[PDB]
RNA sequence: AAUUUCUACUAAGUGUAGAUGGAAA
């Protein structure tokens, strides 16, 4: 029994499926001569204006009911929160008041005028009613429930949880403080009081009332709480026209006046919170864009206003401008500094400083608490900045001249994309066949996009000590209109990236409400809705409203033309389904339930708590178990065979019996003539379920989706497969016209793409039109289903691949490695160590009848990539490689699949947060954790459609062996048969010993590359191998505590390839040097020798050939020729790895190239976690570390081989 | 309705990446918080169809018991006996008030073969089986306030 | 270049091979 008999019938599930639906015989036609269309595309589209309109009446309530409220405890909430902390318990007081004041003002909300009638069925009826709407908003007479999706949320605006859209968390807690706030503000504006500038006119023209300082005194709050108060509020902060040209100053402006004298230092008004795209055309979306990003627009001024505070700077403090810690601060590094790790060295020495010790050598762990320690910070003032740089760095200067150079280029996109908001502008072609306009607004919306990636860091996530609050008013008042181009890049971007179809589809309801929630026979004349097989054609029936009993009285047809009908019973939910029939009043009143089984149920002692009794319990599953019986729906329509009553420890264990055995389905027939008959009648609707695999000439295999759907009404349904219900059913729109698609011909030789293909050209009998489904319109189905209803082997599976793990004895493992020269690479190893199988995934296998034709991925990524290239690498072209990525990443999964249920493995798999990517890695992140959802998923059911349905592997007994996707970090360090493995020291690695370089060898001065070759043991020369064997402890150097050997007598032959395309030998180049500087080089330890010289090219070019010794990865990077792996130290037997070596067999013992080693150093880091799986009891299990480290993974890989 | 759907699920996403370092208690919380936001994020995305007899839906005592273990406070729920959220035992039920709603129009009796009092007591149950969702759903969502107020995380 | 849908196809001729869990903001 190996390691997947176990894992099936685990846990539940809910696929669900979708087919289409065509309708047959005069089915359309009755359906547009019955008009039950135009109902549902109104309550499709009209439902958006009646929620207009409710919102309409909504705000108007507020306003309303907001007139006539002054709140009593504001006074005793404002005065004793700005009497100058000192709490004590008395802030408790301040939010016991502040949750007392909401509860006032809600209580003036629910006695508001009724306000019970807000959210029930009558809204839709009798108030908003009382022009053309009166049909709008009575076009839903018999049809309410779809408002409960909005009168829950409205209500939820009413409430006083603090929530965030309510209504009273914002007029106590966001208004209040700032309206106090501007109080304590007004006393520092009383010095600039000119009573012709603010009193001679606002006063005159706004209100009329009680002057400027009863706003900031408290007692017009309860003025200022309606909307019409913020507008007053707000006109007296900015400054009202009223309709003339006047442009009346405002406060804010009164106070810009103050800066005259060269000091402003007095902190503005704030402008109160009021109380409550395109994607469609093309000269719609042109206008909204010029709207938004004109040389007048609202974030264009943002800008501007950005630039001077940029270039006025220096005037705030250097001690409160926080620089966000960081993914931007290795840019900010770059550009203050000079290179992507300046900071994070000062920092490193500045901790080290304090923490190591007197010593220097470091150890790994260490290094991981100083990486956390580092993160552990959350921002750097711009003084740290000043004091980590040395002379001649002035930040103030430098980040200004650097947002300057920002914003000029901002400017220079501009100059060049000035022909765009011009107002005689043309559009000579749509935007999915132009380029130049399309590439502009690209430009300019990822540039100032990029300037706000730039500007982002200078927040530093607030509460903190005194930041510059006189700056970051302004800058937050900013970049609050900086952020809003998202709104416009996620416009233009889904815009242009759409496809030209379109799929939006109302939900079809037939008149009725209540449509197709089950398939209950003795409901079906309630829900309306009814399945028919017929030969393979299978149906879906309609029946209308006035005729709902059209399938009860039909004879079972013995003239032989029979559709079979279904009969779907289904208990539905038993563990609350069967309290809420017998004791329900009619029950009761029909079979009496005992004196003492009454009680015993409303006391409740059949569940847990300990007030469980057995033999308690046992008299009302004796009860359940007679009521059933005497049920006359239920003694009859199931075969119900349950235990005894001493054969059920729990309750919950006889819900599971009747949850088991409650589901059936079979099949009484009907006739043919009278049934299509009746749907001429009109009385029936009925439709095909129809997708390209009920055609009479799919002479292949199905889809997944049909073999389920196909299994769904076998006699093998025994593997608890179960239709469930919440069925639903969907319509189209033409989104193309027929005429305008390119249509290949018919009788002409057609072109191929495929280039592997040795049929270079075919021809068809007929035509084949390009996206012929977005035609006509069509009937989308969905049909859920509900995959391994009752669970059987029920376990955590976590636990159970590690307690069958140690147990097995040799157990294989399959790793998976991304690459530059490869998309995936697959190896297969053994419990020892022996490369199984080793293949790459870039060409993909179509194995069906007999035959194998292949195709490639990764020539497609090239041909499509040089298409980004010559095209300006615009986002059509981006989203097409990232779909042709999503496609990839599907169809590696049945290789995946069928290699685990042909080796019986466990999947190993590269870890991310733990990562470095490189970059040119053709599978980024992104794309890499869709591949981790699109695994999980597929993995946890398990199926390969070849197989037989009822064997295990089949389509009735898959295979669980993961868990649900759950979010993005709880996928880490162990997923059922899916392992997480942190890539670290995993492609640059000699396969053979473990030699790996750990030596920073890029060259610094003469006056650390002395001490540095003089550290090494023995630099010479064999004559009789003509090697430059060099010789070293690893202990002597270092950032080198990880290695286990320390012993590494490297060599040099085999040429590598230097970059400066720099193809080079080794050991020649090392004698050439050596001949430049005159040496006799073969009376070893020449170390002497070497430290005597003082020229820094001859160290330069040495440290250069140093690193050409240890670099072990070598790319051609044009071709993808030589890509090998060559490690210049060797094994016991004399001879050290090359991968040309071992490229030309047929199945190695060692890995072929770059990407396969960097699978099979994962392969390996699994077989160390399995090693450490069986060396523990299975009381740890769960607890048994995976994260293997570099140390225990460098000696793992060194001592596996000896 | 895709634009949005992406970005405030990479939202979401973002501050459950981040939020995972926050807390620096005793344990790995967020494992069972994450775990509930989602349930959460599932009860609240399609309450309707628990309403509905047999769809595909599958509670507080079982959330208090993977919620102890970790050692949280607990949620201080509304109802622990759930039974009597109505949903389509529309043979199973009498004793509703609005019979004298439905009596002062013309309607008909307490006999549902009648296809305008069927639809007369499906709203009814309907918005009750809601309104009763919500409060539930008001009770988690209490819960993560003040275990966000109270350790400074944020969940919603 | 045919598709419940998505990707690569043309694969023996109205399709082929893998995938796909839907409604909802
Ligand atoms: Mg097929
Ligand atoms: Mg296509």
Redesign the pocket.
């Known amino acids: 029994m190996s390691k997947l008999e176990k894992f099936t019938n685990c846990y539940s599930?809910?696929?669900?499926?979708?087919?289409?639906?065509i309708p047959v015989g005069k089915t359309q036609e009755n359906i547009d001569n019955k008009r039950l269309l135009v109902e549902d595309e109104k309550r499709?589209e009209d439902?958006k204006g009646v929620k207009k309109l409710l919102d309409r009446y909504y705000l108007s309530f507020i306003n309303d009911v907001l007139h006539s409220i002054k709140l009593k405890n504001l006074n005793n909430y404002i005065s004793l929160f700005r009497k100058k902390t000192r709490t004590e318990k008395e802030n408790k007081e301040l939010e016991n008041l502040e949750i007392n004041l909401r509860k006032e003002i809600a209580k003036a909300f629910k006695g508001n005028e009724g306000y019970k009638s807000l959210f029930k069925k009558d809204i839709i009826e009798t108030i908003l009613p009382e022009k053309d709407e009166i049909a709008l908003v009575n076009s839903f007479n018999g049809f309410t429930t779809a408002f409960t999706?909005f009168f829950d949320?409205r209500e939820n605006m009413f409430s006083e949880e603090a929530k965030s859209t309510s209504i009273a968390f914002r007029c106590i807690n966001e208004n209040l403080t700032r309206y106090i706030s501007n109080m304590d503000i007004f006393e520092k504006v009383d010095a600039i009081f000119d009573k012709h500038e603010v009193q001679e006119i606002k006063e005159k023209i706004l209100n009329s009332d009680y002057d400027v300082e009863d706003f900031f005194e408290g007692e017009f709050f309860n003025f200022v709480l309606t909307q019409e108060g913020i507008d007053v509020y707000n006109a007296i902060i900015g400054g009202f026209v009223t309709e003339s040209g006047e442009k009346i100053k405002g406060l804010n402006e009164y106070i810009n006046l103050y800066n005259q004298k060269t000091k402003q230092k007095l902190p503005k008004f704030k402008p109160l919170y009021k109380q409550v795209e395109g994607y469609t055309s093309d000269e719609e979306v042109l206008e909204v864009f010029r709207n938004t990003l004109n040389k007048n627009s609202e974030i264009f001024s943002s800008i501007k206003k950005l630039e001077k505070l940029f270039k006025n700077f220096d005037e705030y403090s250097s001690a409160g401008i926080f620089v966000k810690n960081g993914p931007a601060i290795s840019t900010i590094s770059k550009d203050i500094f000079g290179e992507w790790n300046v900071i994070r060295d000062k920092w490193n020495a500045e901790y080290d400083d304090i923490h190591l010790k007197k010593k220097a050598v470091v150890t790994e762990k260490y290094e991981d608490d100083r990486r956390k320690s580092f993160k552990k910070i959350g921002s750097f003032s711009l003084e740290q900045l000043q004091e980590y740089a040395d002379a001649d760095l002035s930040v103030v200067e430098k980040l200004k001249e650097i947002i300057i150079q920002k914003v000029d280029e901002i400017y220079k996109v501009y100059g060049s994309s000035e022909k765009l908001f011009d107002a005689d502008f043309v559009l000579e072609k749509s935007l999915k066949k132009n380029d130049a306009v399309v590439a502009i607004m690209k430009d300019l919306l990822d540039s100032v996009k990029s300037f706000e990636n730039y500007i982002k860091a200078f927040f530093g996530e607030g509460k903190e000590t005194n930041r510059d609050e006189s700056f970051y008013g302004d800058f937050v008042l900013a970049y609050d209109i900086l952020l809003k181009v998202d709104h416009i890049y996620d416009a233009i971007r889904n815009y242009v990236t759409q496809?030209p179809?379109s799929?939006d589809?109302?939900?079809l309801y037939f008149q009725n409400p209540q449509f197709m929630g089950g398939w209950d026979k003795d409901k079906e004349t309630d829900y309306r809705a009814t399945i028919l097989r017929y030969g393979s054609k299978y149906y879906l029936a309609i029946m209308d409203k006035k005729y709902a009993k059209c399938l009860q009285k039909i004879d079972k047809d013995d003239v032989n033309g029979n559709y079979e009908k279904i009969n779907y019973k289904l208990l539905p939910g038993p563990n609350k389904m069967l309290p809420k029939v017998f004791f329900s009043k009619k029950w009761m009143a029909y079979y009496n339930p005992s004196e003492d089984i009454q009680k015993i149920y409303k006391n409740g002692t059949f569940k847990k708590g300990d007030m469980f009794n057995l033999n308690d319990c046992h008299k009302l599953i004796d009860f359940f178990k007679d009521s059933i019986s005497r049920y006359p729906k239920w003694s009859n329509a199931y075969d119900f065979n349950f235990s005894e009553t001493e054969k059920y420890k729990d309750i919950a264990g006889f819900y599971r019996e009747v949850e088991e055995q409650g589901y059936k389905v079979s099949f009484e027939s009907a006739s043919k003539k009278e049934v299509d008959k009746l749907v001429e009648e009109g009385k029936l609707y009925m439709f095909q379920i129809?997708?390209?695999?009920?055609?009479?000439?799919?002479?292949?295999?199905?889809?997944?989706?049909?073999m389920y759907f196909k299994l769904l009404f076998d006699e093998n349904n025994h593997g608890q497969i179960r239709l469930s219900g919440?069925a639903?059913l969907?319509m189209?729109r033409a989104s193309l016209k027929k005429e305008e698609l390119?249509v290949?011909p018919?009788n002409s030789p057609?072109?191929?793409?495929?280039?592997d293909?040795?049929?270079?050209?075919?021809?068809?009998?007929?035509?084949?039109?390009?996206?012929?489904?977005?035609?006509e319109d069509?009937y989308?189905?969905?049909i859920?289903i509900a995959i391994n209803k009752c669970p059987k082997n029920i376990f955590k599976i976590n636990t159970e691949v590690r307690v069958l793990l140690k147990h097995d004895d040799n157990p294989y493992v399959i790793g998976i490695d991304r690459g530059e020269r490869n998309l995936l690479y697959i190896v297969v190893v053994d419990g020892k160590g022996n490369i199984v199988e080793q293949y790459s995934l870039n060409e993909?296998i179509?194995?069906?009848?007999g035959?194998r034709?292949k195709?490639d991925?990764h020539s497609?990524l090239d041909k499509?990539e040089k298409e980004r290239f010559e095209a300006r690498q615009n986002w059509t072209s981006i989203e097409?490689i990232k779909?042709?990525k999503?496609?990839?990443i599907?169809?590696?999964?049945?290789?995946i699949?069928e290699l685990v249920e042909k080796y019986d493995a466990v999947i190993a798999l590269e870890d991310l947060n733990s990562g470095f990517k490189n970059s040119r890695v053709k599978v980024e992140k992104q794309v890499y954790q869709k591949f981790e959802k699109?695994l999980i998923?597929?993995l946890?059911?398990m199926?390969?459609?070849?197989s037989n349905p009822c064997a295990t592997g089949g389509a009735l007994k898959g295979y669980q062996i993961t868990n649900?996707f759950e979010s993005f970090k709880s996928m880490s360090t162990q997923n059922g048969f899916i392992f997480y493995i942190p890539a670290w020291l995993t492609s640059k690695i000699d396969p053979s010993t473990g030699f790996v370089n750990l030596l920073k060898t890029k060259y610094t001065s003469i006056a650390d590359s002395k001490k540095f070759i003089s550290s090494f043991d023995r630099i010479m020369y064999v004559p009789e191998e003509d090697l430059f064997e060099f010789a070293l402890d690893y202990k002597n150097f270092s950032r080198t505590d990880a290695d286990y050997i320390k012993k590494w007598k490297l060599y040099s032959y085999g040429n590598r390839i230097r970059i400066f395309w720099e193809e080079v030998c080794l050991t020649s180049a090392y004698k050439e040097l050596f001949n430049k500087y005159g040496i006799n080089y073969q009376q070893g330890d020449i170390r002497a020798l070497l430290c005597e010289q003082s020229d820094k090219a001859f160290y330069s070019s040495f440290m250069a050939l140093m690193s050409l010794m240890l670099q072990m990865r070598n790319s051609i990077t044009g071709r993808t020729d030589v890509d090998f792996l060559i490690s210049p130290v060797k094994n016991s037997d004399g001879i050290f790895y090359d991968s040309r070596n071992y490229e030309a067999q047929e199945n190695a013992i060692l890995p072929k190239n770059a990407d396969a080693n960097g699978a099979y150093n994962i392969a390996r880091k699994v077989l160390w976690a399995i090693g450490q799986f069986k060396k523990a009891e299975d009381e740890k299990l769960d607890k048994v570390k995976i994260a293997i480290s570099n140390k225990e993974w460098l000696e793992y890989a060194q001592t596996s081989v000896k | 309705?895709k634009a949005?759907?992406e970005a405030?699920?990479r939202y979401a996403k973002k501050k459950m990446q981040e939020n995972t370092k926050i807390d620096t208690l005793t344990d790995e919380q967020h494992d069972a918080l994450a775990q509930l936001c989602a349930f959460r994020?599932?009860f609240?995305?399609?309450k309707?169809?628990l309403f509905l007899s047999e769809?595909?839906f599958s509670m507080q005592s079982d959330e208090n018991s993977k919620l102890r273990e970790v050692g949280l406070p607990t949620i201080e729920w509304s109802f622990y006996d759930n039974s009597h959220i109505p949903d389509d035992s529309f043979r199973e039920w009498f004793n509703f008030a609005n019979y004298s709603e439905l009596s002062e129009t013309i309607g008909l009796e307490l006999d549902l073969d009648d296809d305008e009092t069927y639809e007369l007591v499906y709203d009814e149950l309907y918005t009750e089986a809601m309104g009763e969702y919500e409060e539930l759903n008001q009770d988690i969502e209490k819960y993560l306030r003040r275990i966000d107020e109270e350790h400074g995380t944020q969940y919603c």
């Open positions: 599930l809910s696929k669900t499926l979708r087919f289409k639906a499709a439902y999706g949320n496809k179809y799929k589809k109302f939900k129809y997708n390209k695999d009920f055609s009479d000439k799919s002479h292949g295999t199905p889809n997944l989706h049909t919440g639903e969907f189209r390119v290949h018919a057609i072109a191929n793409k495929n280039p293909n040795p049929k270079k050209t075919t021809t068809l009998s007929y035509d084949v039109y390009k996206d012929k489904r977005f035609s069509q989308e189905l969905h859920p993909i179509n194995n069906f009848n035959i034709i195709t991925y497609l499509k097409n779909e042709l999503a496609g990839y599907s169809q590696v999964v049945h290789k699949c699109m998923d597929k946890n059911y199926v390969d459609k070849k649900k | 309705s949005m759907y405030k699920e994020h599932k609240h995305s399609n309707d169809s769809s595909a």
